[PDB]
């Protein structure tokens, strides 16, 4: 099957260089162009770069003319993007994509729509530094409702780089549960919450633990959340 | 630069249903060669973009014949016959006139499903995070649709601005609805500074807004 595979992906900070790569299956590489294609976290596609089959033609967006190289090597099935004077805002998932038509020189090269695209890497472009999150309760507070569904949850602040998981009482309880996607805060810092609606009559005989885990900084949290 | 404006930028499908999508360049798109360089995408949840559409008309191999695209010149159409539930993601136009490649800004497709209004709860900041010279205040709405929402947060009945930050779950597999926090974002000497907090919440389901609120301290 037709495939591309991305790889080179990974935090970086301003300033500095990243290689990504893109390893191909299954068709002759040195006759087809090549895209990169970037998507930034909750954003649209944006075009990057393009390269002729034989690597002797390159063509850029304005946002990453000079600072990104696109490369080929046509002996090894594989493509390149060379990410020179990195900004935050280089900060997305990097997808290479294949022209959907075979095209060759026979005054000018032709180029058309991609048809398969590979899964992507990330590459997160900050100047922060690996952090381990601090884990708060969101508790029911304070006491006197009408009774009928609470919630509670906890709010996990703080942290670098990106992913944190996070579970209940170690992935025993699913139900009513919301993890919410991380924001990224001014700081230069993620936070997110995770919630979970359950009977107010069951705050005190049942027990409640949110388990956090952010492998980059190799903390475990477990949390007993308890109402105020 | 070719500019391309796809509406609308949200749609909320019936399966069974026709769901139409629109595409304009602000250029021509139709090429030296007699083609006209304007493609379609989907990108289902979790997943890489997939082509479903080249050269305005021409589907994929192995795309379902549910697709159809048409138009010409500035004006383009994705049309999808009877929708399914698989049909929900994004998707965007693209054009391949001249570089650079521009897509338009996408528009996502959700499952149509009865108004339900959010359930509302307001978190004070934990004594914890106190402690640190910061406080959280978090304000959740659950299990809403459809996903138009407006939270704003009041503190002793001034509206806040700047100061918090809005995320929300996909749509949910067995319910169809969204869930939503907004986080509220204070010093904790502002935050000692006034009594009440409140975050009000608009939202269609609702007769008029409801405001969920706690003292501090109390």
């Known amino acids: 099957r037709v495939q591309l595979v991305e790889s080179g992906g990974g935090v970086v900070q301003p300033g500095k260089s990243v290689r990504l790569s893109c390893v191909v299956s299954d068709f002759p590489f040195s006759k087809y162009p090549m895209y990169w294609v970037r998507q930034a976290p909750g954003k649209g596609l944006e075009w990057v770069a393009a390269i002729s089959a034989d690597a002797w033609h390159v063509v850029y967006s304005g946002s990453v003319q000079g600072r990104f190289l696109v490369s080929r090597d046509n002996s090894k099935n594989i493509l390149y993007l060379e990410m020179n004077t990195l900004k935050i805002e280089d900060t997305a998932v990097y997808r290479c994509?294949?022209?959907?038509?075979?095209?060759?020189?026979?005054?000018?090269?032709?180029?058309?729509?991609?048809?398969?695209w590979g899964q992507g890497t990330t590459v997160t472009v900050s100047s922060a530094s690996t952090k381990g999150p601090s884990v708060f309760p969101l508790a029911p507070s304070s006491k006197s409702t009408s009774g009928g569904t609470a919630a509670l949850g906890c709010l996990v602040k703080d942290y670098f780089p990106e992913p944190v998981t996070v579970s209940w009482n170690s992935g025993a309880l699913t139900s009513g549960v919301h993890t919410f996607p991380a924001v990224l805060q001014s700081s230069g810092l993620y936070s997110l919450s995770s919630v979970v609606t359950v009977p107010s009559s069951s705050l005190g005989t049942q027990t409640y633990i949110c388990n956090v885990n952010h492998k980059p900084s190799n903390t475990k949290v477990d949390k007993r959340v308890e109402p105020k | 630069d070719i500019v391309m404006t796809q509406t609308p930028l949200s749609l909320s499908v019936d399966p069974g249903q026709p769901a139409s999508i629109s595409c304009k360049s602000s250029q021509s798109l139709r090429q030296s060669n007699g083609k006209t360089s304007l493609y379609w995408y989907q990108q289902k949840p979790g997943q890489s973009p997939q082509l479903l559409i080249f050269?305005?008309?021409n589907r994929f191999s192995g795309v379902s014949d549910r697709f159809v695209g048409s138009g010409s010149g500035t004006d383009f159409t994705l049309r999808i016959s009877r929708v399914e539930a698989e049909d929900v993601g994004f998707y965007y136009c693209?054009?391949?006139?001249?570089?650079?490649?521009?897509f338009g800004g996408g528009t996502k497709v959700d499952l149509k499903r009865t108004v339900a209004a959010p359930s509302v709860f307001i978190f004070p900041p934990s004594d914890e995070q106190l402690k640190s010279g910061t406080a959280s205040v978090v304000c959740l709405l659950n299990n809403f649709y459809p996903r138009e929402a407006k939270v704003q947060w009041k503190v002793d009945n001034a509206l806040q601005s700047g100061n918090s930050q809005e995320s929300v779950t996909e749509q949910d597999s067995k319910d169809s609805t969204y869930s939503l926090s907004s986080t509220l974002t204070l010093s904790k000497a502002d935050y000692e500074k006034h009594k009440v907090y409140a975050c009000e919440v608009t939202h269609q389901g609702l007769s008029s807004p409801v405001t969920k609120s706690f003292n501090r301290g109390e």
């Open positions: 994509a294949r022209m959907f038509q075979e095209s060759g020189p026979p005054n000018y090269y032709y180029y058309s729509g991609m048809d398969v």
């Open positions: 693209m054009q391949s006139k001249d570089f650079p490649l521009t």
């Open positions: 050269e305005v008309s």
